[PDB]
Amino acid sequence: IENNVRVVVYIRKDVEDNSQTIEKEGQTVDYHKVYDSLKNVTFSSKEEQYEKLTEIMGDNWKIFEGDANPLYDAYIVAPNDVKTIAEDAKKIEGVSEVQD
Amino acid sequence: LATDIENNVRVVVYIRKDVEDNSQTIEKEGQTVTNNDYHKVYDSLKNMSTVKSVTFSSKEEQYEKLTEIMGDNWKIFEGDANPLYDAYIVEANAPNDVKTIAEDAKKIEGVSEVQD
Ligand SMILES: CCCCCCCCCCCO[C@@H]1O[C@H](CO)[C@@H](O[C@H]2O[C@H](CO)[C@@H](O)[C@H](O)[C@H]2O)[C@H](O)[C@H]1O
């Protein structure tokens, strides 16, 4: 991954940029314009982030299992060419935060 | 004001996120009405003979303490809903009462988890 060339872009909790079907009603359904808007790069799920967290810190966090995942879906994305797209990435609608 | 109790005598009782045990009023049908379940968890804990005190710890103050321990704000979470839990810090009368208090606390309606 490498810190030097990496930017993290967390997407808002109320946005589903990668599940095509969206069930607000009981049935099928914004989209990929998050994805390749940064292309002009890879997706990291909140559920993977949570497994990685337990892997790093030790066993489950038993007090949270019965409730929603508080982490954010994100997209993991030259050294001097960093601060730029960081600012750029906060522009996009739906994005919660970005980190450089 | 700060609470001060020994580890060997403490039980943490985590409150279900949909239970407002410490709110005297809630909104029902668009009006502010008294909360009929106010202090239901508190009262079940306080009424155990083996319990010395029961102190509310809000998720807001827990977050503040978390940043005071770990440093800085967790920037990317700020503005979003606090995922920590409201809790009661329970002080047992004696260390041998802790295991019984925990099990008994788990059964209370409105309790999400307990840590002994
Ligand atoms: C699964 C792993 C668990 C990770 C847990 C993450 C760490 C806790 C994150 C909590 C961040 O959530 C944040 O909480 C605090 C207090 O509740 C709130 O920020 C606060 O700032 C001002 C003052 O600075 C307070 O007066 C006010 O109570 C609140 O808005 C904020 O509204 C919320 O956005």
Author numbering:
A (entry chain B): 54 to 82, 86 to 96, 103 to 139, 143 to 165
B (entry chain A): 50 to 165
Q: Any passages from the paper?
A:
FtsEX comprises a cell division-regulating integral membrane protein (FtsX) and a cytoplasmic ATPase (FtsE) that resembles an ATP-binding cassette (ABC) transporter. Hydrolysis causes a conformational change that is transmitted through the membrane via FtsX, an integral membrane protein with two extracellular loops (ECLs), denoted the large (ECL1) and small (ECL2) loops. The folded structure (residues 57 to 166) reveals a central core composed of a four-stranded antiparallel β-sheet (β1, β6, β4, and β5) and two helices (α1 and α3), an α-helical lobe (residues 107 to 135) harboring the α2 helix, and an extended β-hairpin (β2 and β3).
Three different structures, with resolutions ranging from 2.0 to 2.3 Å, were solved by X-ray crystallography, each in the presence of a different detergent. In all cases, two independent protein molecules are present in the asymmetric unit, arranged in such a way as to keep hydrophobic residues from their α-helical lobes buried. In any case, the crystal structures suggest that changes in the protein backbone and side chains of the helical lobe occur when a detergent ligand is bound. Changes in W123 and F126 stabilize the hydrophobic region of detergent 1. Full stabilization of the hydrophobic tail of the detergents is completed by the same hydrophobic residues (W123 and F126) but from a symmetry-related molecule.
